[PDB]
Amino acid sequence: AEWYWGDISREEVNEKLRDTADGTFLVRDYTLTLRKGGNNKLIKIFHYGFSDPLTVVELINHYRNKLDVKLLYPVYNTQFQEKSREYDRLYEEYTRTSQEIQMKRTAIEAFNETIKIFEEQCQTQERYSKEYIEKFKREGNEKEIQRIMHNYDKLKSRISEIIDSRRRLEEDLKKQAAEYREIDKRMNSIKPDLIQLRKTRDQYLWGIHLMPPRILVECLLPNGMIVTLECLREATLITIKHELFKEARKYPLHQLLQDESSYIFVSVTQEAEREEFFDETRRLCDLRLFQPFLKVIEPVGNREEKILNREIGFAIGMPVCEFDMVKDPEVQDFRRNILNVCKEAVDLRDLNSPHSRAMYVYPPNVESSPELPKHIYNKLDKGQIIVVIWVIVSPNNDKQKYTLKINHDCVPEQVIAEAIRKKTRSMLLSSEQLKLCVLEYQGKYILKVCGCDEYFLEKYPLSQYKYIRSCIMLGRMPNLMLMAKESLYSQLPMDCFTMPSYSRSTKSLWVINSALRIKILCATYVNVNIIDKIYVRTGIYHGGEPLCDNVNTQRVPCSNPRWNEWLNYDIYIPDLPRAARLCLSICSVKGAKEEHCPLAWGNINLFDYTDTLVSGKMALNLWPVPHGLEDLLNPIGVTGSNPNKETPCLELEFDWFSSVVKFPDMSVIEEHANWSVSRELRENDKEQLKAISTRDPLSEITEQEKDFLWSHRHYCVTIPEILPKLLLSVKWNSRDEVAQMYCLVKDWPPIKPEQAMELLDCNYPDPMVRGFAVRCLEKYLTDDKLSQYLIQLVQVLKYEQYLDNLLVRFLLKKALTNQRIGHFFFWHLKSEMHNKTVSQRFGLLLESYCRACGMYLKHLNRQVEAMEKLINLTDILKQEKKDETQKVQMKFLVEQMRRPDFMDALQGFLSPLNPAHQLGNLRLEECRIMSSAKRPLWLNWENPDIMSELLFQNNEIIFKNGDDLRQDMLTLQIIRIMENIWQNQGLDLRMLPYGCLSIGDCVGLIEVVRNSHTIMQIQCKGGLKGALQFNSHTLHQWLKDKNKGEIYDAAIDLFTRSCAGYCVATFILGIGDRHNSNIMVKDDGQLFHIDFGHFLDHKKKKERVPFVLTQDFLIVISKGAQECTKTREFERFQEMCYKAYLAIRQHANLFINLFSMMLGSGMPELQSFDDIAYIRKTLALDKTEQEALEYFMKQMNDAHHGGWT
């Protein structure tokens, strides 16, 4: 048959029905996919009919004759590489030009503020100079007239050079803007052709880095005089102000000047802010002045708040005054209302002082559960662990130690008690005297991990602390230091929280009888080549699902984007769900199959945060299209206008009703729900419900199953984890069904947080659904799990419709009551602030955090400053140094890191990877640029801790610039979760999820693993065997040299086990292709991988086993024999792989969710849901356990050419 496609993937079926007419259909292995109402409906066919009784080609023709009508419509490689390479070259110039334009627009604003201040200076000068010249003229002085006019000559000459500089920059911007539009036009012509060419392929100071040692700054006095003052670059504003007022006595009109104590300095900054400097401690070179000038004004406003606002704006990367001028009431309501969360968190952590404040700053670092897996309890002997308690005596740092043997699960106070028992053994204390000495030490002291800042402040069993637990795993001696609480409490400054200064008829939607219509008026411009026609494509979406077929305006010549057309959507105003959004775009049609492409896009919430339906006329500035998005609309994108107004602006008009239209309140919804039920339980049913709740979030659900789930919706309460599948069964364009769903959700039973997190992704926009998910997290989500999943929870904030919601308030409360959560809460937000889509939401949330976070803001600012100097330095190497040989680059590195300004910033701060790790003085001999192509930085710090010798004496981080490390973070997160699953199932497989943190745009930090080498580095320690060929046995021989004696077997074991872990994990996730420089081995034999920046389907345009065991690894697993495949050790290696693969398959739902919550980000290789489907295929979810294991073997076989059977 013509419409029978046999076996084809769901992703391929969606591609054929995309943007088609209602009635389009096909059939596959049976399964009938039908296009209705803008969606693709799935109608199953049983071996034939749709439902009992069964009455094949026969029934398909009968229906060609809920769902109304259907069955109308059944369903060079050198040129693609030539067009694709050109497109990527234009995209490079497109983003560089886009970024350079932003810096210029900011510099124009700095020029405007500068010229405004200088124009004020001329006015005040003309004011005072006017009256005193007339007096001096009357008196015939003529010396004072000349002196005044002499200073006015310099002022007028100075202000003219600034106006000339602004005019010169405006013209350069005007030129580069026109160049940006042309680049935009060239890419808009290639997009349709490049897609078509690929489809057929498949068918077969400002500007000055630093100030000079002495600099000349022009001080603008309130009497109108401009005075030149030579300053040391490091001089404080205190010194500058005092010297300035000595020099002012040499200038005319001195007597008008008040005392210097009555004034402060104001100036302009590289961020184009007009900044009053209330803190006069600050050095001149640290002010980030736009130009070298200062204006003397009288201070206005609260001193302490202005000082704090500067510190906040530095951490945020944006001036706080920019939020003051936003006229959007939702923005100003969020700033004021979110302070309620700040006050609760501050009140909660101060409840029992100092202790609860210490619990906030140094929260216990602890595993999820006290229960130890069986093989871990066997590592410790008899149930007891040997720990070393250290005491510091005398100012000389001399340290006495006491070795204890105690139960693994005994608490920290019981450990301290045993230290006292061992010390007092010979003192012959009575039973009561021993109790008194133990109670004193338990009260006066706590335990601290030697080598970092980590403390046991809480009653958790000792084996549950991450540090002790790690020691048990690794077979290392725990080293703890006895420390007085009074020393820890003075280490925490008591801080107070001050409220900022900004703390101070209608109608019903369901009443309107009418359909939904929106008028498209016109667009200011678009960038296209005179492409044939353009049009505005619109649609109404709930989540990613359309609520009705898309509606287009009429086509119009590119020269004239005017429509003035009413678009009629099929849907009923009372049927419009609360979370419905309007998604629209401007598209072009090249004249040929009519290739379409999306010039620009934008989204709108059809109800504002007050539940008001949009009305009247609206102007919407649109957004550039994301890199690899070929769809004509972008429902995942963020709502709201583009803050950049230099971009195409579409004008809309919304239907008007006699008054304001509001969404109904809950009492009317429930009353409507009872009205719908009024006008409207077998063993196999209970088993089908159980079966539907097990399948993965991305599994297909037919229409017969959606009706089955909805008919049984009242019985679904007994299987609460089925809720996501039930929500998909709802018709969200019917208020009758949504009203009933609300009455279920409010009473719905709670569910596990890992399951509730799914309801926070882009598929579940509804407020009631989302509010239910957050209440689930509020009760059942521990601070440990919240830390693990924090990258996903921060990501789903983007899909929230409004600034003020339940999820934001939950996360901010937790960040402000837990400083380990707050640290990464801050950095996850700060890294995306470059992204203008989320920059306002995240900027506002960082402000609220920084106000209530307490004394930690000083430490965060220290980290932000240090990262800025590393970003600046590495960006220089990317541009200037990009050519010259690495021998020269290292000369520039050692020279730049030697600057005392650089040295002060990069020494004595906390590692953003692990705030518990203090970063001391840099060891510069160890600092280098790595020899890899991307040329990242290798940085080495001393550990300042007195006990550092017992943990590590050097901290090493890789600072990598130019790659997006959010993908590494997701992989390393998944690696860690995979290991915890395997560990709790009795499989001991060591994985190495080293720390990775993205601090900005394609910039971040990576933890260095000590005592590790790449396979390449190890083969080079060896020698050649065949012609121009490394020896296959070098790796195995190297491990023999590192592990000799009885420890040899332990290394081969650890090698084989860790090798099994990265075989399974790498195959499941589709990690980028492995090679000898991204694979590594420790001295003990533990194997791990690096360079995780690729995952899933990324080779789709251009599956596979990334990690392929070569002769080198098989020699180690089999302990150096010949024919490694036939050995019993390689069989045992395969068993580990098979068992570890099935373990992940059972947990598949968790990992699919983790990827789904990340869709909103700009990660290049995670774009649509079809990218996540790669994991469905590698885990063989739609298959069965027996078949899925056979699937894994066949993939390993084909990649290794035999050996698996």
Ligand X SMILES: COc1ccc(-c2cc(CNc3ccc(S(=O)(=O)Nc4nnc(C)s4)cc3)cc(C(=O)O)c2)cn1
User: What is the binding site for ligand X (CB under 6 A)?
Assistant: 508, 510-511, 513, 574, 668, 671-672, 675, 679, 930-932, 934, 936, 958, 960, 994, 1006, 1008-1009, 1012, 1014, 1077-1078, 1090-1091
Q: Shortest approach of ligand X to residue 326 CB, angstroms?
A: 35
Q: Which residues have a C–N gap over 2.5 Å right after them in the chain?
A: 29, 47, 55, 65, 75, 204, 504, 530, 591, 680, 1102
Nearer to ligand X, 907 or 1077 (CB): 1077
Q: Shortest approach of ligand X to residue 670 CB, angstroms?
A: 9
Task: Report the alpha-carbon distance of residue 761 to residue 799 in Å, rounded.
Answer: 7
Q: Shortest approach of ligand X to residue 1081 CB, angstroms?
A: 11
Q: Shortest approach of ligand X to residue 1054 CB, angstroms?
A: 17
Please check whether residue 469 is in contact with residue 463, taking contact to mean a CB–CB distance below 8 angstroms: yes
Nearer to ligand X, 506 or 513 (CB): 513
From 634, 547, 646, select the one nearest 587 (Cα to Cα).
634
Nearer to ligand X, 937 or 1059 (CB): 937
Nearer to ligand X, 450 or 867 (CB): 867
Nearer to ligand X, 511 or 888 (CB): 511
The three-class DSSP label of residue 317 is: coil
Please check whether residue 1043 is in contact with residue 1085, taking contact to mean a CB–CB distance below 8 angstroms: yes
Q: Shortest approach of ligand X to residue 512 CB, angstroms?
A: 6
Q: Please report, for residues 335, 383, 1001, the alpha-carbon distance to residue 810 in angstroms, rounded to integers and kept in the order given.
A: 16, 40, 26
Strands 445-449 and 455-456: antiparallel
Please check whether residue 320 is in contact with residue 313, taking contact to mean a CB–CB distance below 8 angstroms: yes
Phi, psi dihedral angles at 682 (to 5 degrees): -125, 165
Nearer to ligand X, 342 or 739 (CB): 739
47-48-51-55 Cα dihedral, nearest 10 degrees: -140
Q: Shortest approach of ligand X to residue 676 CB, angstroms?
A: 8
Residue with tokens 């739609």: 1182
From 551, 553, 562, 566, select the one nearest 526 (Cα to Cα).
562
Task: Report the alpha-carbon distance of residue 588 to residue 531 in Å, rounded.
Answer: 6
Q: Shortest approach of ligand X to residue 511 CB, angstroms?
A: 4
Q: Shortest approach of ligand X to residue 514 CB, angstroms?
A: 8
Q: Shortest approach of ligand X to residue 509 CB, angstroms?
A: 8
From 453, 606, 491, select the one nearest 540 (Cα to Cα).
606
Q: Shortest approach of ligand X to residue 1088 CB, angstroms?
A: 8
Local structure of residue 451 (DSSP, 8 states): T
Nearer to ligand X, 376 or 922 (CB): 922
Task: Report the alpha-carbon distance of residue 43 to residue 634 in Å, rounded.
Answer: 27
From 210, 208, 207, select the one nearest 899 (Cα to Cα).
210
Q: Shortest approach of ligand X to residue 827 CB, angstroms?
A: 18
Q: What is the identity of the amino acid at 967?
A: Q
Residue with tokens 């579409």: 650
Nearer to ligand X, 100 or 956 (CB): 956
Q: Shortest approach of ligand X to residue 1008 CB, angstroms?
A: 5
Q: Shortest approach of ligand X to residue 934 CB, angstroms?
A: 4
What is the distance in angstroms between the CA of the first residue and the CA of the last residue of the chain? 39
- Cross-strand pairs, 34: 25, 41
Nearer to ligand X, 525 or 675 (CB): 675
- Cross-strand pairs, 283: 236
Nearer to ligand X, 296 or 1018 (CB): 1018
Half-sphere exposure of 623 (CA within 13 A, CB side): 25
Phi, psi dihedral angles at 957 (to 5 degrees): -130, 145
Tokens of 46: 């049983």
Q: Shortest approach of ligand X to residue 886 CB, angstroms?
A: 11
Please check whether residue 233 is in contact with residue 285, taking contact to mean a CB–CB distance below 8 angstroms: yes
Nearer to ligand X, 672 or 841 (CB): 672
Q: Shortest approach of ligand X to residue 575 CB, angstroms?
A: 9
Half-sphere exposure of 345 (CA within 13 A, CB side): 27
Tokens of 488: 């820890």
Q: Shortest approach of ligand X to residue 656 CB, angstroms?
A: 17
Let me know how long the chain is: 1205
- CB neighbours of residue 40 within 10 Å: 18
Q: Shortest approach of ligand X to residue 679 CB, angstroms?
A: 5
From 453, 446, 457, 449, select the one nearest 478 (Cα to Cα).
449
Nearer to ligand X, 574 or 626 (CB): 574
- CB neighbours of residue 1102 within 10 Å: 6
Residue with tokens 């020699």: 1115
Nearer to ligand X, 774 or 978 (CB): 978
Helices and strands per DSSP (H, E), number in the chain:
39, 34
Tokens of 1129: 């050790």
294-299-300-302 Cα dihedral, nearest 10 degrees: 110
Nearer to ligand X, 836 or 934 (CB): 934
Q: Shortest approach of ligand X to residue 925 CB, angstroms?
A: 14
Task: Report the alpha-carbon distance of residue 194 to residue 197 in Å, rounded.
Answer: 5
Nearer to ligand X, 358 or 673 (CB): 673
Task: Report the alpha-carbon distance of residue 825 to residue 811 in Å, rounded.
Answer: 8
Q: What is the identity of the amino acid at 237?
A: L
Task: Report the alpha-carbon distance of residue 56 to residue 45 in Å, rounded.
Answer: 9
Nearer to ligand X, 220 or 1006 (CB): 1006
Task: Report the alpha-carbon distance of residue 116 to residue 110 in Å, rounded.
Answer: 10
Nearer to ligand X, 744 or 1006 (CB): 1006
Nearer to ligand X, 936 or 1070 (CB): 936
Task: Report the alpha-carbon distance of residue 727 to residue 717 in Å, rounded.
Answer: 13
Local structure of residue 758 (DSSP, 8 states): G
